[PDB]
């Protein structure tokens, strides 16, 4: 800062912090790397194991999620929703993307075998967040004896729940308890951590085998759906997006997300968001990424590998290239409507310009400009081999 | 301790001002908006006291200002850029009484007047941190008339030199050539070394009243009214709430109010907001409360009294207890429609969550996860009191 | 001083180019961002100084930029996210005959206002007799930018030795265009063409800079016969659109959001006015925005006073310079030359102007005996202060 994207290189980036849980783990990624604190976002990403309960927390960010493995239960909690009789739980599968607003209550839980994966950018530039450059999560059950290792400065102690904080005859006489049950709330030296292990059952909702102003707005839809896709060449893959247009909800969150699935070979051809910072999540297999920065260096040149993070902060470019069987990845960005802008291809801001620009401008030949400017007849998506 | 961590506050004190501009016929008295607990809010504050017959000279800012008249009696006037013009003509002059709450887009001229017998109390936060404000983390009040010797002692680069009025800073020349008047009468304007400061009292009469796209919708609005307040439980207290839907016109300001008046033992239940800092200003009486961290720590555990600020970030948990025969306070939210969050009541957020996530999440019984969730019958106040 | 007290300022200067990229046919004169008065208002600000047959080889930003078209005439060429293709180019000798396709080329002339979103690429060319000018505000506060405090060009083919010099720590890195970047190979499988080919589309040590002189027919525009086609494009030295017209004294035209729709999101403004000598603008100053002023033609004197009440610039401003005034910072300026042109850019989709003389004045709105028991002055006196100009935004005077 205040140059915070004066960016030279970029890295695959992986967890740093890993709050180890009775029933899965919370992993974090450092929000401190440069190209985090470039986007304005953290990451990250729950890892959750059969019978597993993600206990209620909320935050100070909006939060975009997609579940990226297995399925579960998710439910959402909000002020003034009608809420055994509790407010609305959901069936999450892979493929789901899942908007919250600031300072709302979630848990989620694993019924199968398969571990649930759910991967989530809080939102931390948004003006919506009217804290801190920190991703600052609020337990409302769980303890977290490794303490907010993921901000600085906080010198080793426990993160308590939300309830810990008061005192237990407060607790008692607002909830209308007895003051044991009071502390029993508290979690106090409670070891389990966030993701706990369901005791017996969970008759939460019966999934029937039978078969602002917006309150009543839905807040899931799913992105691995090719019907709603932004392209579709089957033999290459699609992308899908996600938009204001396609969750009115996203207006506010100011946050947008994308979904691709490429097979081996398939290139993404070379571009750049004009009004969004990315960070690209990949779910399934490997690609060939190559970045460029505002200098037009390469600030990155690599592989991007199942599990990785790589930020392309505004206005940077990059280019894709499958390099596994298939890739598939998940591209959160920081704009509720988020454009692309190609660089090749029949809609790139080359093809817009007059020939005599391009010939000029890379002193080349009139008829190699008019091969670099029409030749590549694909949009986005295009055939490549190679390394 | 400061910023991009400026939230990761260990406590909070209640605060009183930490400057006082003295005048004529009253003070000014200015809050410390680099205390850690303010700035990471993001609002500073400001109390008038004008006493019998004072004048608060017209000064606009650079940010949006959500005003308070907590106790007194008295005339106030707005100058809109430009409009109805309604043998003096001026513009609207209003009256104003306790209770009564008032908003002020940014560079609009404010002034007032005690026309009554007891001191004239305004109290007012300015949004620091809003995109409205293009200068400065710093209250900078534009003095159209009040010279003042002290100087901007809140704001730090000052170095105790003196702050006078706009027009002094034109040369007398240029002031007379465009208000069309006789040099002489320009220097006047200027007044230097006027010691009373902007708290003036005023010579004999006082007979004022006597002749984005909004210069009409409605700008004031008073909070002591108990029968259009939000809750009204006459054993127990009132509470009051300034929204968007209130007055339209805070949907530009980003600022709210909530106004509370309950009586001894009255408690108000744990509550956080999703989506708003706040500031608590304590008008009449003296109230404990208790406030929480996102580690789920105490920051504050204490007496709060007359004429104190309590700064309650967005996330942090705060229950309120009447120590006093009646305590009176009022919440400045940065957001123009904040929405509260409770922990405990029939809107609580366990009311939203299946009972085997009450019942896993603090490994309780079942019989003590239904009182959890459902003793507490009460929305938003309730006795100090348990089984 | 310095963040969060960037406008605690105690004066103000007229301002000019602090670097200086000089380019084949042309140069790109930047202003210094990191100065105390430019970083209180949050913007930079830059000058195209482009030569004839002067092509400025596109370009696009990561944050809001509002041109203006000081001296001269030309062609522009924006190209947005996927847009049908408007213009067609007749091909001179024909076989094989294809035409061009590709966006839309405007005509430019002096007056006119340009506006841009973040990630739209324009590129300038002087057809021009005399040198082209286009003066820039970039908005590097606004939301839009989500990168940083620095005002940055993308430049698609234009290489520039000189490299980033008006951000801190570039250390005389030349700076290349985004295709040098990328391999050749990845940028050859993109394009489908020659290897060869996508060497040279990178530019490589290319000392034209970014703008060059154009070899040949540029003939672009051959025969003319949810916003996605807006109106980007206006003239501000048109008075048939001005908010004040006194043919004896100038005019003062003005590009709200109410004008250009775009604006609403650019969160941008501007404010174009033209005086002859001894004309004044009574004190103004921006309700919700912060200004940046800039001559056009000929010099003015101008008091600057800010919120301590102490003057913070009182001198001669002209041609080519530039003064930046913060939200609530209250201006005047006497046009001292023959006339006085300028250009302000305001950081508000819409902006307020609040005078403190004449039938609008802040003044005027007060009661008598808040003006007279305010500056202590006679009740006689204040009818005078309020009430003797009558002129809303200009006068004359000497």
Same mark, same amino acid.
């Given at each position: 800062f205040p140059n915070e994207c004066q960016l030279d290189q970029l890295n695959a980036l992986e967890p740093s912090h890993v709050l180890k849980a009775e029933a899965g783990r919370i992993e974090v990624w450092d929000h401190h790397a440069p190209q985090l604190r470039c986007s304005g976002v953290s990451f990250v990403r729950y890892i959750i194991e059969s019978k597993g309960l993600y206990l209620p927390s909320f935050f100070s960010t909006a939060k975009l999620s997609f579940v990226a493995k297995g399925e579960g239960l998710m439910g959402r909690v909000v002020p003034g929703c009608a809420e055994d009789m509790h407010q609305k739980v959901e069936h999450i599968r892979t493929g789901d993307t899942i908007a919250t607003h600031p300072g709302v209550a979630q848990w989620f839980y694993n019924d199968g075998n398969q571990p649930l994966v759910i991967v989530s950018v809080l +939102?931390?530039?948004?003006? @919506? #967040? @009217?804290?801190?450059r920190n991703p600052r999560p609020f337990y409302l059950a769980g303890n977290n !004896? %490794? &303490? %907010? =290792?993921?901000?600085? &400065?906080?010198? %080793?102690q426990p993160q308590k729940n939300?309830? $810990? &904080?008061?005192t237990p005859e407060v607790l008692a006489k607002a909830f209308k308890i007895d003051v044991r049950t009071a502390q029993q709330l @508290? #979690? @106090?030296? +409670? $070891?389990?951590? $966030? /993701?706990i292990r369901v005791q017996?059952?969970?008759? =939460?909702?019966?999934? !029937?085998?039978?078969?602002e102003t917006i309150?009543?707005?839905?807040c899931t839809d799913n992105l691995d759906d090719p019907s709603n896709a932004? =392209?579709?060449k089957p033999q290459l893959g699609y992308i899908s997006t996600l938009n204001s247009y396609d969750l009115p909800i996203l207006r506010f969150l100011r946050l947008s997300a994308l979904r691709g699935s490429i097979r081996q070979n398939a290139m993404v051809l070379p571009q750049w968001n004009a009004n969004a910072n990315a960070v690209l999540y990949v779910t399934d297999g490997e690609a060939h990424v190559q970045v460029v920065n505002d200098n037009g260096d390469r600030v990155f040149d690599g592989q991007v590998s199942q599990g990785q993070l790589l930020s392309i902060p505004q206005g940077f470019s990059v280019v894709k290239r499958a390099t596994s069987e298939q890739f598939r990845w998940i591209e959160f960005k920081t704009n509720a409507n988020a454009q692309i802008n190609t660089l090749? &291809?029949? *809609?790139?801001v080359l093809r817009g310009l007059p020939l005599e620009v391009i010939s000029n401008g890379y002193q080349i030949s009139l008829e190699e400009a008019r091969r670099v400017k029409? #030749? *590549? /007849?694909? *949009?986005t998506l295009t055939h490549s081999s190679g390394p």
């Open positions: +939102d931390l530039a948004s003006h @919506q #967040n @009217q804290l801190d !004896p %490794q &303490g %907010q =290792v993921w901000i600085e &400065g906080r010198e %080793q939300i309830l $810990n &904080g008061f @508290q #979690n @106090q030296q +409670d $070891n389990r951590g $966030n /993701i017996g059952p969970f008759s =939460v909702i019966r999934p !029937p085998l039978r078969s309150c009543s707005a839905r932004d =392209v579709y090749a &291809g029949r *809609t790139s029409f #030749n *590549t /007849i694909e *949009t």
